[PDB]
Structure 1
Amino acid sequence: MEFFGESWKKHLSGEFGKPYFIKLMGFVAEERKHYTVYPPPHQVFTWTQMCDIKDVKVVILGQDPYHGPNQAHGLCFSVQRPVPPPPSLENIYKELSTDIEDFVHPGHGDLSGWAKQGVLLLNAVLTVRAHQANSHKERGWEQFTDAVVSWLNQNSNGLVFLLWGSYAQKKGSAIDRKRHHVLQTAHPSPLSVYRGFFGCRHFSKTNELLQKSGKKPIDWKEL
């Protein structure tokens, strides 16, 4: 048992020997020698440990991990107990409450329950230097997450991609818009939420698009 889930390691292993990835991991290792980097090494790839790669039905793509202590744990927008939901997640919960009739604030911020149902909780960038948002951008993470999105695009049909924010939206060109459903809106952060996130109804729309393709809907309340 390791950092990468078996099925993800098997299909993404071709990236490991590529120069950008070797250099990216070197950069991250060097950053950890001088600064506090989030999430810890063992949690950078938690998004690969929740379900099999072939069981992915929905992909939520954020910007980068939470940059505060004890927050990021490798699943986008998620925080393990007893850490309270950060601002971006409180906004996700508010949208879910107005979008899904049965949804109420669960009392925690752990999104493992969604990930276990086949919801890939990914960020465009997978590490961040403490207290500095998007500090690890354009270092190689985007090419790796492009590989993840491209694999899902080429080897699956009818997935739902929820691209939240400008950085996540750059992955729109790696997806065949006629074969998969791409939903784009502003990032849920308080700084951008009013630019489209509130009222986007992405959660009900995702379930309707899944049910149309004959696939089982996501139980957003299963947390």
Structure 2
Amino acid sequence: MEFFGESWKKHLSGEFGKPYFIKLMGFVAEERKHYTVYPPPHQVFTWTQMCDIKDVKVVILGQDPYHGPNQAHGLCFSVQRPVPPPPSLENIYKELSTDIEGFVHPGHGDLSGWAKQGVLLLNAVLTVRAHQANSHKERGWEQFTDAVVSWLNQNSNGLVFLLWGSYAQKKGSAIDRKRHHVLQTAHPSPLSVYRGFFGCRHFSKTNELLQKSGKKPIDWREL
């Protein structure tokens, strides 16, 4: 398993030999043989490269990777320079501008600076055929990313899960809320952002909740 962080591999590699995962890898490989699939192979598991699994403090669950050229890079919501922030990310930055007073839009969409601090930016589906939205859904990724969420749920303490939209909320429905904190609202995309996302103050609330378990806050400006 190339490009997969060692601390994550230690705890999740039990998935790799299961029939569903073998089937998944075979499918993705057959897709790559004939098509361009995003993100590129070295970025499928960026979320395992940015920080140690035990240093994860905050978990933001997404759905599918971006399917446009150069957009997906292995972190939900994020795009690498010089790709313009997509609409949902511009709205995330708008909420940061009022919640974390003094936050200035960084002029790019790369959320790596959060990932390094222990914000896990996990899509549920980790690849997509180029230009074809949701094309790799229901092929095995969901079970794998369920394993990731379940490991964190059972092994970590005092995480904050941010569940934006119904898909993410369903994926987080069995989180232990005595052990961790769950904040839920509408998705930040323009069609739903006015239905709860603006004003949610999840960024400030996250840091207040992290303090309850002695964790230093996320520096949301460090992008």
User: What range is the shorter-chain TM-score in?
Assistant: over 0.9
Query: How does 1:1-223 map onto structure 2 within 5 Å?
Result: 2-223=2-223
Q: Quick one: distance in 1 between partners of 2:110 and 2:99?
A: 20
Q: Which runs of 5+ in 1 are unaligned?
A: none
- Pairwise CA distance, 1:132: 3.0
Q: Quick one: distance in 2 between partners of 1:189 and 1:141?
A: 23
- Pairwise CA distance, 1:174: 3.3
Closer, same or farther in 2 for the Cα pair 1:221/1:178, shift >3 Å?
same
- Deviations, residues 59-87 of structure 1 (Å, cap 9, x unaligned): 11111111111011001111111112111
- Pairwise CA distance, 1:213: 2.0
* Higher deviation after alignment, 56-65 or 163-172: 163-172
* Higher deviation after alignment, 184-193 or 201-210: 184-193
**C-alpha RMSD of matched pairs (Å):** 1.5
* Higher deviation after alignment, 165-174 or 59-68: 165-174
- Pairwise CA distance, 1:135: 2.4
- Deviations, residues 159-193 of structure 1 (Å, cap 9, x unaligned): 00111222222222331121100111222222332
- C-alpha contact (below 8 Å) 1:82/1:108 kept by paired residues: yes
- Pairwise CA distance, 1:92: 0.8
Q: Quick one: distance in 1 between partners of 2:148 and 2:54?
A: 12
TM-score normalised over the length of structure 1:
0.95
Q: Quick one: distance in 1 between partners of 2:171 and 2:20?
A: 18
Q: Quick one: distance in 1 between partners of 2:187 and 2:33?
A: 31
* Higher deviation after alignment, 190-199 or 50-59: 190-199
- Pairwise CA distance, 1:33: 3.0
* Higher deviation after alignment, 42-51 or 162-171: 162-171
- Pairwise CA distance, 1:208: 0.8
* Higher deviation after alignment, 148-157 or 165-174: 165-174
- Secondary structure in 2 matching 1:191: coil
Q: Quick one: distance in 2 between partners of 1:64 and 1:190?
A: 17
* Higher deviation after alignment, 93-102 or 44-53: 93-102
Q: Which runs of 5+ in 2 are unaligned?
A: none
- Deviations, residues 37-57 of structure 1 (Å, cap 9, x unaligned): 211111010000001001111
- Pairwise CA distance, 1:194: 2.5
Q: Quick one: distance in 2 between partners of 1:131 and 1:198?
A: 29
- Deviations, residues 16-41 of structure 1 (Å, cap 9, x unaligned): 00011111111112222343321111
- Secondary structure in 2 matching 1:114: helix
- C-alpha contact (below 8 Å) 1:123/1:168 kept by paired residues: no
* Higher deviation after alignment, 65-74 or 33-42: 33-42
- Deviations, residues 79-122 of structure 1 (Å, cap 9, x unaligned): 11111211121111011111110211001111111011111111
* Higher deviation after alignment, 190-199 or 18-27: 190-199
Percent identity reads 99
- C-alpha contact (below 8 Å) 1:38/1:67 kept by paired residues: yes
Q: Quick one: distance in 1 between partners of 2:8 and 2:155?
A: 13
Q: Quick one: distance in 2 between partners of 1:138 and 1:163?
A: 20
- C-alpha contact (below 8 Å) 1:62/1:187 kept by paired residues: no
